[PDB]
Amino acid sequence: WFFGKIPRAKAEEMLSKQRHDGAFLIRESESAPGDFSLSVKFGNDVQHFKVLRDGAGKYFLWVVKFNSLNELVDYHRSTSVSRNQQIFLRDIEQVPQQPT
Ligand SMILES: NC(=O)C[C@@H]1NC(=O)C2(CCCCC2)NC(=O)C[C@@H](c2ccc(CP(=O)(O)O)cc2)/C=C/C[C@@H](Cc2cccc3ccccc23)CNC1=O
Numbered sequence: 001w002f003f004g005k006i007p008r009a010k011a012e013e014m015l016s017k018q019r020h021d022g023a024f025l026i027r028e029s030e031s032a033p034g035d036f037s038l039s040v041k042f043g044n045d046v047q048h049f050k051v052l053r054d055g056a057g058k059y060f061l062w063v064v065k066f067n068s069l070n071e072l073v074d075y076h077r078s079t080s081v082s083r084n085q086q087i088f089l090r091d092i093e094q095v096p097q098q099p100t
Contacts, residue, residue: 001073001092005030008039008048012091016042023091024073026051036069040089042082049081 003011006027013099015023022040028036036051036059051072053059066072077089 001023001094002069003027008046008094011039011048012041015039015046018090018093020090022087023092024076024089025092026069038072040081041065042085042087047082 003014003023003025004027006014006095011025011027014025014029018041022042024038024040026036026038028037034053035054037048038051039046039048049061051059051061051069055064058065059069059072060066061072064072066075073089077091079088081088081089
C-alpha cells in the first residue's frame with residue numbers, strides 16, 4: 001500500500017481503479033525524507049490524512065501511535081478511521097508483479 005513519489009492525482013487513480021470501498025495508499029515526499037501521507041477513497045471523493053511522528057520513527061494521527069507504519073494501516077483496518085461514517089482501510093491492490 002506504500003508508494004514512493006506520487007502526486008495526489010496518481011493516488012486518487014490507484015484507489016478509484018480499485019473495486020472495493022476504503023482503499024488506502026500512503027505516499028512519501030521526494031526531497032522530504034521522513035514524511036508520510038495516507039490517501040483513502042471515500043465515495044466520489046478521495047480523502048487523506050497527514051501522518052506525523054515523534055521521537056524518531058514512531059508515527060501517529062490523533063491519539064494512536066506505533067513504531068512502524070504497518071501498525072497504523074492495520075490498527076485502522078480493524079478500527080474505525082473516519083469521523084463521518086463507519087469504514088475501514090481496505091488493502092489496496094499494490095502494483096502487480098509479473099516476473100519473467
Ligand atoms: N492527521 C490528520 O490527517 C487529521 C487532520 N486532517 C483532517 O481533518 C482532514 C482529513 C480528510 C478530510 C478533510 C480533513 N484532512 C486535511 O486536513 C488534509 C491533510 C493532508 C494530508 C495529506 C496531504 C498530501 P497531498 O497534498 O499530496 O494530497 C495533504 C493534506 C492535512 C493535515 C495537516 C494537519 C496540520 C498538522 C501539520 C503538521 C503537524 C501536525 C501535528 C499534529 C496535528 C496536525 C499537524 C491538520 N489536519 C489534521 O490533523
